[PDB]
């Protein structure tokens, strides 16, 4: 699975369905420009055991929450929305799943 198609209300908050299978850890990124060779921008940061959206001056209010991960329902302006799914016993064994949105 390389992409996940999900449905939500355009421009309103949406808890993203995590496509990572059992025994995989999830981390959310934007892949800049949807270009494989480009940087991955991490969307959430852990502080004192809780996760919060990184306040990028540019990204705006795209990330509504990291408890749970919640976006405004739209494609990111800066690139693709990607979750990295990492196997619980081998962090070098992972697969990235791009999330794309249909609108209701
Ligand atoms: Ca990617
Ligand atoms: Ca073993």
Residue numbers in the entry: 18 to 121
Paper text:
ORF8 is a viral immunoglobulin-like (Ig-like) domain protein encoded by the severe acute respiratory syndrome coronavirus 2 (SARS-CoV-2) RNA genome. It tends to evolve rapidly and interfere with immune responses. The full-length SARS-CoV-2 ORF8 is composed of a signal peptide (residues 1-15) and an Ig-like domain (residues 16-121). Herein, we determined the crystal structures of SARS-CoV-2 ORF8 (S84) (one of the epidemic isoforms) and the bat coronavirus RaTG13 ORF8 variant at 1.62 Å and 1.76 Å resolution, respectively.
